[PDB]
Design an enzyme around this catalytic site. Structure first.
Site, short mmCIF file in Angstrom:
data_model
loop_
_atom_site.label_atom_id
_atom_site.label_comp_id
_atom_site.label_asym_id
_atom_site.label_seq_id
_atom_site.Cartn_x
_atom_site.Cartn_y
_atom_site.Cartn_z
N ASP B 200 0.67 -1.44 0.12
CA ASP B 200 -0.20 0.04 -0.07
C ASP B 200 0.92 1.26 0.12
O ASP B 200 1.19 1.73 1.08
CB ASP B 200 -0.79 0.04 1.20
CG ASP B 200 -1.96 1.19 1.30
OD1 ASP B 200 -2.05 1.97 0.35
OD2 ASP B 200 -2.30 1.58 2.48
N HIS B 356 7.50 3.91 6.40
CA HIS B 356 7.74 3.77 4.67
C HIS B 356 9.00 4.81 4.30
O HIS B 356 9.13 5.76 5.17
CB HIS B 356 6.95 4.06 3.81
CG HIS B 356 5.88 3.00 3.61
ND1 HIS B 356 6.22 2.05 2.45
CD2 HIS B 356 4.47 2.44 3.70
CE1 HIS B 356 5.33 0.94 2.53
NE2 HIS B 356 4.14 1.20 3.22
N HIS B 390 7.26 -3.49 4.83
CA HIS B 390 6.91 -4.44 3.66
C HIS B 390 8.23 -4.44 2.68
O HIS B 390 7.86 -4.92 1.76
CB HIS B 390 5.72 -3.65 3.17
CG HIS B 390 4.58 -3.65 4.03
ND1 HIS B 390 4.74 -4.10 5.36
CD2 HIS B 390 3.50 -2.89 4.07
CE1 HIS B 390 3.51 -3.47 6.00
NE2 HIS B 390 2.84 -2.52 5.25
N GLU B 415 4.30 -8.85 -0.64
CA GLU B 415 3.17 -8.53 -0.62
C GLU B 415 2.17 -8.92 -1.87
O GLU B 415 2.43 -8.43 -2.92
CB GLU B 415 2.82 -6.98 -0.20
CG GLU B 415 1.27 -6.85 0.42
CD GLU B 415 1.06 -5.66 1.03
OE1 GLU B 415 1.67 -5.12 1.52
OE2 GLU B 415 -0.27 -5.21 1.06
N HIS B 417 -1.57 -8.54 -1.73
CA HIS B 417 -2.72 -8.09 -0.98
C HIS B 417 -3.88 -8.29 -2.13
O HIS B 417 -5.00 -8.66 -1.64
CB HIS B 417 -2.65 -6.90 -0.24
CG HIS B 417 -3.82 -6.50 0.73
ND1 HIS B 417 -3.82 -5.54 1.37
CD2 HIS B 417 -4.89 -7.38 1.06
CE1 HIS B 417 -5.03 -5.51 2.25
NE2 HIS B 417 -5.56 -6.81 1.86
N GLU B 460 0.53 -9.18 4.27
CA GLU B 460 -0.76 -9.60 3.69
C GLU B 460 -0.46 -10.23 2.36
O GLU B 460 -0.94 -9.83 1.16
CB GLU B 460 -1.42 -8.05 3.30
CG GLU B 460 -1.79 -7.35 4.55
CD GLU B 460 -2.20 -5.91 4.17
OE1 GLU B 460 -1.80 -5.30 3.40
OE2 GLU B 460 -3.18 -5.50 4.84
N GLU B 536 0.55 -3.81 13.31
CA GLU B 536 0.07 -2.64 13.01
C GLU B 536 -1.32 -2.35 13.74
O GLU B 536 -2.03 -3.43 13.92
CB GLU B 536 -0.39 -2.66 11.50
CG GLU B 536 0.46 -2.74 10.25
CD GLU B 536 0.06 -3.13 8.88
OE1 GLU B 536 -0.96 -2.59 8.54
OE2 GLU B 536 0.54 -3.85 8.30
N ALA B 538 -3.58 1.19 15.79
CA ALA B 538 -3.94 2.69 15.98
C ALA B 538 -3.65 3.30 14.78
O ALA B 538 -2.56 4.22 14.66
CB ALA B 538 -2.83 3.11 17.01
N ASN B 596 -7.51 4.62 -7.97
CA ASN B 596 -6.60 4.86 -6.86
C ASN B 596 -7.64 4.83 -5.75
O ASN B 596 -8.54 4.57 -5.92
CB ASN B 596 -6.11 6.41 -7.15
CG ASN B 596 -7.33 7.76 -7.32
OD1 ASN B 596 -7.71 7.81 -5.93
ND2 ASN B 596 -7.64 7.82 -8.57
N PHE B 600 -5.90 7.44 1.26
CA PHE B 600 -5.56 6.39 2.18
C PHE B 600 -3.93 6.35 2.10
O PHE B 600 -3.59 5.34 2.86
CB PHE B 600 -6.37 5.15 1.67
CG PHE B 600 -7.59 5.07 2.21
CD1 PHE B 600 -7.50 4.40 3.61
CD2 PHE B 600 -8.73 5.42 1.88
CE1 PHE B 600 -8.89 4.11 4.18
CE2 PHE B 600 -10.09 5.18 2.26
CZ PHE B 600 -9.87 4.50 3.73
N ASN B 603 -1.38 8.20 6.35
CA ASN B 603 -1.58 7.71 7.70
C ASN B 603 -0.46 8.07 8.56
O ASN B 603 -0.43 7.14 9.64
CB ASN B 603 -1.82 6.13 7.53
CG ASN B 603 -2.56 5.73 6.33
OD1 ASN B 603 -1.97 5.02 5.37
ND2 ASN B 603 -3.80 6.28 5.94
N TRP B 992 -11.34 1.43 8.00
CA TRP B 992 -12.21 1.27 7.10
C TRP B 992 -13.53 0.50 7.80
O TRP B 992 -14.66 0.50 6.88
CB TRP B 992 -11.60 -0.08 6.33
CG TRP B 992 -10.88 -1.01 7.21
CD1 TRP B 992 -11.03 -1.91 7.86
CD2 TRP B 992 -9.45 -0.73 7.48
NE1 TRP B 992 -9.83 -2.53 8.48
CE2 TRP B 992 -8.62 -1.62 8.19
CE3 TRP B 992 -8.60 0.54 7.27
CZ2 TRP B 992 -7.61 -1.63 8.65
CZ3 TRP B 992 -7.07 0.53 7.79
CH2 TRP B 992 -6.86 -0.68 8.24
MG LIG Z 1 -1.36 -4.31 1.64
#
Ligand SMILES: [Mg+2]
Ligand SMILES: [Mg+2]
Ligand SMILES: [Mg+2]
Ligand SMILES: [Mg+2]
Ligand code: NA
Ligand code: NA
Lengths: 1014, 1014
Positions: B200, B356, B390, B415, B417, B460, B536, B538, B596, B600, B603, B992
């Site tokens: 992500d 990241h 990741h 990943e 996902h 994921e 992951e 909060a 897209n 999101f 974060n 979500w």
């Molecule tokens: Mg993901």
């Protein structure tokens, strides 16, 4: 066209890259036929959509891949020949096969292979009907290519492919043409995959397994798995069938799984595609799982191979069939519980053997006739398990083991024995992809077969992190089978079973980093809970399998000792032809091949043509499913069958005195599995004549089975009953300076007074001796006596090396005494000799000869052995008789060759065989044919009495020593007799170190035996 | 030349083949510099044998790899531009970056990628000195290329390479030339490796990490591993150093490993090559292991990063150095014992954050300045751990974490996902080689770093057999670190730690196959023994982190709850420019990119420029290493440090009444790790004036550290002390049909009798209101209120969706009552309204206004909420004041924005900030700036008193709702005040699904608050 050319294709050199193990290969799967009729799928009738390409192909051989002309991609070479596919080209003579055990056949420089890489170019011109081209997918299957290849179809490159023992499949839909088509296959002998294929066997190459075309629908069955769960008492079972599809999913698409018992359907399930939720993204839309409930399922085992037929049918909702797939289903459960491997809830006792895929004429090409022969011969000798030695087998083998009832250990094609250290590549993550392919594709191909009960990670590749990763992968993907692996000490975290190679019963072998404990000590090691099954034990190289009874005593005494696999089934000998055009068995180095390991390729229980060795009967006796105890007059019969009642069993019992039958009987065996049956013998004879009463029982199967004929003996045992000890015209001696002459009627005896031996014996005027009767302390060395030692390197601890160092083969007799005295009724000759080597006396033999007035010459022998010399191989007499007789008759253990540590299978009786039957034609000649426990021996006019061991043949021990091949042996003038008071054991725990147990070694300093000649 | 051409190179399409992940790549290893001087190696001075190729390269962009001309392999294109390496070409504008969360940026058809595959062509012309060419090996290192590339040097193809987040190294010895050389790098945006890179984040491509040339000797250090074993009390340590060599082994070759503490050598070992016996074939001749004994080692931790310097020197026996290698060594031990993760024997409490690698201007290119900034900001906020989100990070990051003291979870670049199901590729053995490469090379590169304490298998990707295999591989290769993995339910056999994503403290989330239990319930599940650390938790999207105190209460209460990693550190926002050339923060879809996931991508706890969000101080307060208890007059200080004594700690305490300081003090903190210190306050003031006494303590570090300045506040806490309750010229009402007018001196109040609201207030002749004071029940929705719902798909369970369905944003007030009564000393105005949506009354508000003769207007509000309507976001008042003032002064919780479920870090006091400080510039605008627990609020001439929450800014809630970007907001005419009696929580467990706890929801039917305006 430029990118399809050999210059562009061969420039990457994918055979020197372990990151590339395949290009354009399709996924591995269970065997398919793409039946378009459910009844044909159910009945296993041939499929029109599977076409075999076996036959006559065109073949050209090249020294290297860069010698192949570019024209070969377009049209057949003029120099190309017509050969048969499948085959090995070494068996057609284009280059030599190589036998190497540990050392690689190439320079060890991974991933690089020699520039001079022998190259086979295979071509096939074939036709395809237009119906195949219009619709569906057409794929070619190569069941096996050694060791790597490139594929062209009509001049367009298709794919590479590396792994040699698993099927390689390429889609040909975009390459085929209406009408005539051409295939071009370039096969390389060496690749980076050769580093993972260092198994102890002949090194061959080519398209040695079947090539076929498969046509499938566009919407097709791509994969299916069958699983059987059970309840506690196995009265209820669930058949889980997971089916995967390829192509466009449609709502009308259905999958039906029907289970069939013969012609009777027992269960069926229909469902649309779409499995259960797997994770947050849902489940497999292109998969479906069917759960078929089976009440009172018939359980598969080696004793009763109860098989069901499962038919998977892809069809529309209205009913039209698209494609049918079928597989044989066995309901069985394999699990390890509390340190024991259980099958269907019962602890297993593995009567296993390692089997290589070998044929003396076709090399490593397997046919159904030879597979069926092997399975029948194994089951007739009480084997119930087979280990696929170091690679996945021909697909038909697993089906045959399902149908006939053998447990199978399926092994990945991974061996790196010649690496230093052995885990150099298996501890390298750069080789993890290649090993992972070799494991995952084997499991994917063979996971449906009921005969497969154990997965193996490979053989002799050290212990690395790749092994741990692949063991964990197998445990995740297929939890229904345990995983074993021997490398790294046989007890690492990558094995569910302690599986040592050639660990001994009672002796530890503490090697620095990988100790080989005795199997009893191994079980009790602190923290150890796993079962022990020897992946390799009882090395059967030549005259071997001494101490097999010790292994099987331990197997039956210790619960967690659950058996092992004998090494191995068949000798890997090849057929060569002499100048006269006659065939003979060849081993390593007979083809001129680069450094070889000679006769170490022949370790089988049967010859290459599947003729049994004498050790096969010992294995049969030790592995028999009926145990016998004798208490007074009652025979107790214990059944070692786990599942089957003795419903085709009949016990025959006989009592004999000296091979003369006195009583005989027959009772039907009615014993439950793991049960007992007491058998009361009738009032047994009480003879008054002297002799030893012998009770022999036999288990005979009155009827025929799938693997045996009527009258098959499956178990036997012998006991000594009550013994009755024996309670009950003058020879003329003539003395001369050179000889001692004794005359009694037409019989004369000559004793040379310079050598101190009986030189000659006369019956009438006919000589009876070609060679004087002399003491023999040596034997033609066995393979176990030699044990890896050679004239170039020499292993000083080998028995033959110690005998040669001590001078046993070069010892010279010195006459210590020679005197003849005429008693009142007999002539007494007393002789003494000393065998000395370089001022050191090794043996002293003092003998007495007594010739009475009845023509009998009783010989008393007393032998002293120096404690500091190595223990002799035998204490006996040897001579060359002048007469050749057709029959050898004896009272003793027989009728097969037997030795002090390999005589449990032999029964005491009167045996009558031809002289040829008394010689064992081992391909590497050695001492052979010995019969132990012999009280009487008759050969022509001569009778020998006492308690002795003997072997009789037309070959001398010196000739057997000096000859390396059995086809180079010539019968000598007369018959060589070797009568022995005492004989050393033959060993067999391994064939690279001394393996004769101390109790089978002639370690006493003094020995005595008596003998009568008449 | 033909095989080096693009037609031949690109014909295989290795970027659509997952069996090919690299061609001609060298093995992975720890970072090297090839120092030719031991002192330079020890001092970490720049190496002459490592040359950076970063700078100005030549770049051309192409729509597909087949558009690239063949001339580019020989000479630079005229259309090529000059760009900076490392960079991302999306940051130079050649195509658009794509932000997608779950859905792949391409069509999901593995392994195939779009034909229109954007292609970047990089060229560098460089010079090599002839000394490099004469002797030794020269290799190029690409630290990172996204996502796959092909390499040419002087027109000859070298290698392919796929994995984007690990270094790619190719030998260039046979390709370089004396003098000028050219590099050609063709970079493809999409490959088969893109299927394993579905993280992500923004989807970018190019040579985004450093490119360098390394020269090594022919005989060289190829690999080395450092391991530290300890005794029970950690007073003795052994440093095991395993060194591997490449090249020809020589007997004079030696390896020395010396350990250095500053300038003092503490240990040293010299040995020839040749390790111990590994198996039956021996050991590694090209390896050596050194064992250095260290007495009283200084232990590495996050609290004290004690580092040693290890120098590995390859040298001859006479002494001449060949090559030196160096690495920083930390002595620490990580193990899980009895369900607890221990560091140096002590249970860890992870104060972690996911990070990241993002830069708002350079995209995904990392520089040392930004890394150091991030680490300092993390440690200043009581973070002690970081999760590499990741993928493996820039190599300098691990070194910086070693030097500064952060625990590191290193994650493989895996990943999937967007796969359906998520384990579609990770349960496929055809992708096992690619995943195995991505795991093994990360471990091999980073296994020496002391900051790395936990390995992660990825993120994921479901749960497949590939995960189990790779987990087992890591456990075999590196036993010193636990392995975690969250996919498949966060508790599978491929994790040593239960690591759920966004599991809640007390609420279970039972999803069909992958249930998300509450973390307390998860620990006690039958058979569960492992520690729980949330990988992951909060979610910090926008105005978030409500309920953080609940997580940390559970962390400190439950032993096996050992913390977690906040998601996440920094917003992945990019910088775009408007028509006026001004920069603004952009999120998904602002570049025109194909489907897209909008905002999101943001974060983070800090903005892209590393400016903190208000939630950072809440994280700091909840993660502080000092806990405080107040018993009467005694403060109990508990230390949560595990290893360090409070030797740079000083406790400051203050007592204030209403922000008026009465007492202050200072004591030096002297508390042992995990110890207690009781602090006796002096005789505290006993004021007689009314008010609430407040005790505030602070921990201030007097001195400077490597990561903090002097005076750094690290912990704080506030308590209520004794309270003293307060024990202590007529307004003229004028009535008209349209209004109610109240006059008192220069103050006038207007009440519209048709709307029932205070329309206007006069001070003199100056209007004070631009908008009437009206009840407000809604807020501009937060990201947690929106939660994945969008105008196209709509999630009916989201709070904003339920409010819109109920009509809270469209509710219309209906005047129920409006009456004015003149009391003896005051004017009483009583109003009632009903807010109705389509014949359904949602809220009723009854109000009283009392204006006394002192100019104060007390407002009493009673609000009824229908039980069947969704709970309102707030019960308060809103107005637009006509005056803009520079300063906002208030007595209450502050000074930062705080909310009912995110106010533990806020302290009660008197705060004075500029009006701009009262607005939080969230990139996606929403309700913000709220201050809870406020007793007094002053803005210009207006004072508001009571017990309320308020936010004040120049933006209205309607404008914040209707605006999607913070740079599109414009200040309105006056100031918008939102005074609230009650405010709903903001949530934050996830973004979500609804995540506001029930106790933070306005679920009572009736609400009352009072307010004074003067
Ligand atoms: Mg993901
Ligand atoms: Mg290859
Ligand atoms: Mg081997
Ligand atoms: Mg690839
Ligand atoms: Na047993
Ligand atoms: Na805890």
């Amino acid at each position: 066209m430029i990118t399809d050319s050999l210059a562009v294709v061969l420039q990457r050199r994918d055979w020197e890259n372990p990151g590339v193990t395949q290009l354009n290969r399709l996924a591995a799967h269970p065997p398919f036929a793409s039946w378009r009729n459910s009844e044909e799928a159910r009945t296993d009738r041939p499929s029109q959509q599977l076409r075999s390409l076996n036959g006559e192909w065109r073949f050209a051989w090249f020294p290297a891949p860069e010698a192949v002309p570019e024209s070969w991609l377009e049209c057949d070479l003029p120099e190309a020949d017509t050969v048969v596919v499948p085959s090995n080209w070494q068996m057609h003579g284009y280059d030599a096969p190589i036998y190497t055990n540990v050392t690689y056949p190439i320079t060890v420089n991974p991933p690089f292979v020699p520039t001079e890489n022998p190259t086979g170019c295979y071509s096939l011109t074939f036709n395809v009907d237009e119906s195949w081209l219009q619709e569906g997918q057409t794929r070619i299957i190569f069941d096996g290519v050694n060791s790597a290849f490139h594929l062209w179809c009509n001049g367009r490159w298709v794919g590479y492919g590396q792994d040699s023992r698993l099927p390689s499949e390429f889609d040909l839909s975009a390459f085929l043409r209406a009408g005539e088509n051409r295939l071009a296959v370039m096969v390389l002998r060496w690749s980076d995959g050769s580093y993972l294929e260092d198994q102890d066997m002949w090194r061959m190459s080519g398209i040695f397994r079947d090539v076929s075309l498969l046509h499938k629908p566009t919407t097709q069955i791509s994969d299916f798995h069958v699983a059987t769960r059970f309840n506690d008492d196995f009265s209820r079972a669930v058949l889980e069938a997971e089916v995967q599809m390829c192509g466009e999913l449609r709502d009308y698409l259905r999958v039906t799984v029907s289970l069939w018992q013969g012609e009777t359907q027992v269960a069926s399930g229909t469902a649309p595609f779409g499995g259960e939720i797997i994770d947050e993204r849902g489940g497999y839309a292109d998969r479906v799982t069917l759960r078929l409930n089976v009440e009172n399922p018939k359980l598969w085992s080696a004793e009763i191979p109860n098989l069901y037929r499962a038919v998977v049918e892809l069809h529309t909702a209205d009913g039209t069939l698209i494609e049918a797939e079928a597989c044989d289903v066995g309901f069985r459960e394999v699990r390890i519980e509390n340190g024991l491997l259980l099958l269907n809830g019962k602890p297993l006792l593995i009567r296993g053997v390692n089997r290589h895929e070998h044929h003396p004429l076709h090399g490593q090409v397997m046919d159904e006739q030879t597979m069926v022969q092997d399975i029948l011969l194994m089951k007739q000798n009480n084997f119930n398990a087979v280990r696929c030695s170091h690679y996945p087998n021909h697909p038909l083998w697993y089906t045959l083991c399902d149908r006939y009832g053998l447990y199978v250990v399926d092994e990945a094609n991974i061996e790196t024995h010649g690496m230093v250290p052995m885990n150099r590549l298996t501890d390298d993550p750069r080789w993890l992809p290649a090993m992972s392919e070799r494991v995952t594709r084997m499991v994917q191909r063979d996971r449906n077969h009921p005969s497969v009960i154990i997965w193996s990670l490979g053989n002799e590749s050290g212990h690395g992190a790749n092994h741990d990763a692949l063991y964990r992968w197998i445990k995740s993907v297929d939890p229904s089978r345990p995983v074993q692996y021997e490398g790294g000490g046989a007890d690492t975290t990558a094995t569910d079973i302690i599986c040592p190679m050639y660990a001994r019963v009672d002796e530890d072998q503490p090697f620095p980093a990988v100790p080989k404990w005795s199997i009893k000590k191994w079980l009790s090691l602190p923290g150890e809970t796993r079962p022990l099954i020897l992946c390799e034990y009882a090395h059967a190289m030549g005259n071997s399998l001494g101490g097999f009874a010790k292994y099987w005593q331990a197997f039956r005494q210790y619960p967690r000792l659950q058996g092992g696999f004998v090494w191995d089934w068949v000798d890997q000998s090849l057929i060569k032809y002499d100048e006269n055009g006659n065939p003979w068995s060849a081993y390593g180095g007979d083809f001129g091949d680069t450094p070889n390991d000679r006769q170490f390729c022949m370790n089988g229980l049967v010859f290459a043509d599947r003729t049994p060795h004498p050790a096969l009967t010992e294995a049969k006796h030790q592995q028999q499913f009926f145990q016998f105890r004798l208490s007074g007059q009652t025979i107790e019969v214990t059944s070692e069958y786990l599942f089957r009642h003795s419903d085709n069993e009949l016990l025959h019992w006989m009592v004999a005195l000296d091979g003369k039958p006195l009583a005989s009987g027959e009772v039907p065996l009615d014993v439950a599995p793991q049960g007992k049956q007491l058998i009361e013998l009738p009032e047994l004879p009480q003879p008054e004549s002297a002799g030893q009463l012998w009770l022999t029982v036999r288990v005979v199967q009155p009827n025929a089975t799938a693997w045996s004929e009527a009258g098959h003996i499956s178990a036997w045992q012998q006991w000594r009953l009550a013994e009755n000890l024996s309670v009950t015209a003058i020879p003329h001696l003539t003395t001369s300076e050179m000889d001692f002459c004794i005359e009694l009627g037409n019989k004369r005896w000559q004793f040379n007074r310079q050598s101190g031996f009986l030189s000659q014996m006369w019956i009438g005027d006919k000589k009876q001796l070609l060679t004087p009767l002399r003491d023999q302390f040596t034997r033609a060395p066995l393979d176990n006596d030699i044990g890896v030692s050679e004239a170039t390197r020499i292993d000083p601890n080998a028995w033959v090396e110690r005998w040669k160092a001590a001078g046993h083969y070069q010892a010279e007799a010195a006459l210590l005494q020679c005197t003849a005295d005429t008693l009142a009724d007999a002539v007494l000759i007393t002789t003494a000799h000393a065998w000395q080597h370089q001022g050191k006396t090794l043996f002293i033999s003092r003998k007495t000869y007594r010739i009475d007035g009845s023509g009998q010459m009783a010989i008393t022998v007393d032998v002293e052995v120096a404690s500091d010399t190595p223990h002799p191989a035998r204490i006996g007499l040897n001579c060359q008789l002048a007469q050749v007789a057709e029959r050898v008759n004896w009272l003793g253990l027989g009728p097969q060759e037997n030795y002090p540590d390999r005589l449990t299978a032999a029964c005491f009786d009167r045996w009558d065989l031809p002289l040829s039957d008394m010689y064992t034609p081992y391909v590497f000649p050695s001492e052979n044919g010995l019969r132990c426990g012999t009280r009487e021996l008759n050969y022509g006019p001569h009778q020998w009495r006492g308690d002795f061991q003997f072997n009789i043949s037309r070959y001398s021990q010196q000739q057997l020593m000096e000859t390396s091949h059995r086809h180079l042996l010539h019968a000598e003038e007369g018959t060589w007799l070797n009568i022995d008071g005492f004989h050393m054991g033959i060993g067999g725990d391994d064939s690279w170190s001394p393996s004769v147990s101390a109790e089978f070694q002639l370690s006493a300093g003094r020995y005595h035996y008596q003998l009568v000649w008449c």
